[PDB]
Structures are given as C-alpha cells and as structure tokens.
Structure 1
C-alpha cells in the first residue's frame, strides 16, 4: 500500500538498488500493461520490494543465511529506469540475494527454507556495516537447502 507521496526501492538477487519518487509514476486503469521503472539487466529477477518509512532499518539475506544491517540514508537515488549500485557482496559463501526487510532493533525475524526448518532470532547480534560488505553467518543452513522466506516480527 502506497500513500500520496513516498519512495519505492527495488532490489535484485545480483545486488542492485533503485530508488525513485513515486510521483514520476501515474495512476492507470485496471487492465493496463504498465511501464518499466528499473533498468533491469540480464539473468536477474526483481525478488524484493521495500517502501522506506522512518529511518535506521535495513536488512538483507542470501541463500545460505548471510545478511547485514546498513543505514537507509546511504543509498543513492536516481530517476526511474536507471542502473543501481552494488548492495552486498556476492562472494561464494552467500549465494543469491533472496529478500530484504526494513527492521530496526527490538524486533525479531523468521527464516524458512524450502524444506521447513523454521527459525526465529533477534536483531541485536547484527551490527551496522557499510554497503560494500559481505554477509556474516546468521542461520546454520544444512546441505541441499536454500533460504526461501524472510519475514519481520514486531515487538
């Protein structure tokens, strides 16, 4: 749900962030195709969407349960249908970016794999790092497993 004036952030599994004002997009009818809003590359899919609100809340994840917390304000904003910057290091211990959430402290998150294995932990043990950093161990993923879900649990 989007109010009259806010911001839209798009994310990709290859570490792409695109921020632009929602004013540049006009309302349309029901059975309308739409328009392109991000200069998407090749071999990538938009796997997450966040509407920023408040401040000081950002989290990511990978196929092996590696993520980090970064400041919201350090993400550059350009016009729509434009290339973004690298959000997190791909490396080889992480895999592919699955989803992103806007969670501050005093909250908890849940991660579920393709074969169940539900888990619930807090965000106190994850610190604030720079954007160009690799992930750290969050959940001990098992063999033949990849993280599929990521949800935020409030206080």
Structure 2
C-alpha cells in the first residue's frame, strides 16, 4: 500500500494496484483531496504486516502497525492522526521507518538537518509503551530527515539542497546513548539543508530528482570516499530550470518509481527510460508539472 500524510495530519493508505505506470512525460492523475490551505508532506510505500516507527518533532518515538491506519479512497481526505497517537499540541511526525522484525545487534542510523549524525542500537526499541521515548536531543529548529538500518560496517551518503554529496565510512561514528546530540557529519554552507540519506548496498544505480521534475541516473562506483565533516562534490547541476534537489534513492534495473507534487498528481513510471550520464550533468524531464507546483516525494517500487 501507499501511505500519504498531510501538513495538519491526515493519514490514508490505499492499494498500490489501483495506479498504473505511464510513460516519461506524463501529467499524472490526482491522488487525494486537499483543504483550502494544505499540502502533503511525505510519501511511503510499505506492506501491511510491518511495524513502523514514527519520530516526532520533539524527539519522541512511537510504534504502530500499518493496517491500524484508516482505510479510504481517493476522494476522501483521511482522519486526524492525533486520535491514533498521544501527540502534543503542536508536535508533528517527520519520519517513518518500516521494520519487518527485530533481530541481531543491528544499529539505527539517524541524521537530522544542519549535518548531524547519531548511531544507536535497535535493541533499545524492542518494546515501547503508549508514551514515547526520547531519541535525539534536538536543538533549536533542527529536525529529523531520514533514518535507516545498517550493519556493523557499511557506507553512508548525504545529499544537500545545492548538489553536494558526501560519502564516508561509518566506522568513524561511535555508538551513543539515547539522550545524546551527536557529531557533525557534513560541513554545510549558508542556507543549505540535508534532504536525503542513502546507504549503498551492492551494485546498482543512483537516481536523483529536482523540484521541477528533472532527474538522471549515474553509476555508484564513480562517487569517491573521503573523511567525514567535509564538503562534498557536485552531484547535479542545479541551473535554473531544474531548481533545488528534492531527494535521491538507489534504484537498480527493472524497477519503478513514484513521484508526488504538493497537491496530489501522483505518477508512476519505469526506470529503463532514464539514461546513464556523468555526475556533473543535468538530466531530462520526468514530470510535466504545471506552474506553482513542486515535487516533494520520491519512492522506489520493486517487483
């Protein structure tokens, strides 16, 4: 199923088989209805029988199963999420991590904006009560962006909003407790934010997207590895038509992806149509988005 979340908070999931894959330059059809002043925030694709961990805006963590979410159709707008979870007056959800099961001693890698990283063991989150648990000592306006599961030794990649990518070994980061801030991962400039987090696992291709519906596909091996807390390299030329970077994901062959704008307009397409180019190159169109619209979602669909 595919899960959508609004700014005020209105969860909704619908079967994935309803939508169909169009060609590259497609307008797309609407997904849900939006109030007089609202916009969707994030998109998720997961199975029904999977645990999900929700991270709030104040560092709390909550546990839930997918099928407990309300079921609705395209015309509906969903129901407020405050009923499902005992949230605060202004606390909001900003990250969801699907977990099939808890096993071994794997670690949870969490990275916020402004270039901060933190590593914790998954064993701490085996059981959670109705009330949440503090996970990050967030300061000022910093917010979580992405989380993932990693083994003892792996690689981590961070993407900024101005085409800067940093790749470094995860052995530098040391496991810390729950009530800790973390260390600095990437040296940002001025007015730049981290937008995505990708852990490369085996051979594949890296797909990127912008806010105006442009993207490309480059090989993994061309990206270099250096120390942490350093500036990156040019992941993609921002130019003027493309706009800012919105996200990235590692997609191999024979897969499909979905993108969503501020107001519905979901589109699904294959990945074989996207060509292979170098790192410092602007890509081709992916969505023929109308004016006053921005792509704010990107997910991968397997087969």
- Under a length normalisation based on structure 1, what TM-score does the superposition of the two structures give? 0.98
User: C-alpha displacement at 1:87, in angstroms?
Assistant: 0.6
Supply the distance in 2 between the matched residues of 1:78 and 1:10 (Cα, whole angstroms). 13
User: C-alpha displacement at 1:135, in angstroms?
Assistant: 2.0
Q: Which runs of 5+ in 1 are unaligned?
A: none
- Higher-strand-fraction structure: 2
Alignment match, 2:244: 96
User: C-alpha displacement at 1:77, in angstroms?
Assistant: 1.3
Which has the higher relative contact order, 1 or 2, with Cα contacts under 8 A spaced 6 or more apart?
1
Supply the distance in 2 between the matched residues of 1:120 and 1:52 (Cα, whole angstroms). 23
Q: Matched residue of 1:98: which SS?
A: strand
User: C-alpha displacement at 1:38, in angstroms?
Assistant: 1.0
User: C-alpha displacement at 1:109, in angstroms?
Assistant: 0.1
Counterpart of 2:266 (choices 105, 115, 118) is 118
Superposition misfits of 4+ residues, deviation over 2 angstroms? none
C-alpha offsets along residues 40-87 of structure 1, whole Å, 9 cap, x if unaligned?
Answer: 111100001000111121000001110000010111111000111101
Supply the distance in 1 between the matched residues of 2:197 and 2:245 (Cα, whole angstroms). 12
C-alpha offsets along residues 118-154 of structure 1, whole Å, 9 cap, x if unaligned?
Answer: 0000001101100010121111111110000000000
Supply the distance in 1 between the matched residues of 2:262 and 2:301 (Cα, whole angstroms). 20
The number of residue pairs the alignment matches comes to 155
Alignment match, 1:150: 298
C-alpha offsets along residues 91-135 of structure 1, whole Å, 9 cap, x if unaligned?
Answer: 111110000000011000000001110000000110110001012
Q: How does 1:70-109 map to 2 (within 5 A)?
A: 70-109=218-257
RMSD: 0.7
Supply the distance in 2 between the matched residues of 1:98 and 1:107 (Cα, whole angstroms). 20
Supply the distance in 2 between the matched residues of 1:129 and 1:61 (Cα, whole angstroms). 14
Supply the distance in 2 between the matched residues of 1:96 and 1:112 (Cα, whole angstroms). 16
Supply the distance in 2 between the matched residues of 1:63 and 1:135 (Cα, whole angstroms). 13
Q: Matched residue of 2:249: which SS?
A: coil
Q: Matched residue of 1:49: which SS?
A: strand
Q: Matched residue of 1:28: which SS?
A: coil
C-alpha offsets along residues 10-63 of structure 1, whole Å, 9 cap, x if unaligned?
Answer: 001100010111100000000001110111111100001000111121000001
Supply the distance in 2 between the matched residues of 1:41 and 1:76 (Cα, whole angstroms). 20
Supply the distance in 2 between the matched residues of 1:121 and 1:69 (Cα, whole angstroms). 14
Counterpart of 1:4 (choices 130, 139, 152) is 152
Supply the distance in 2 between the matched residues of 1:42 and 1:144 (Cα, whole angstroms). 25
Structure with max Cα Rg: 2
Matched, 1:16 2:160: no
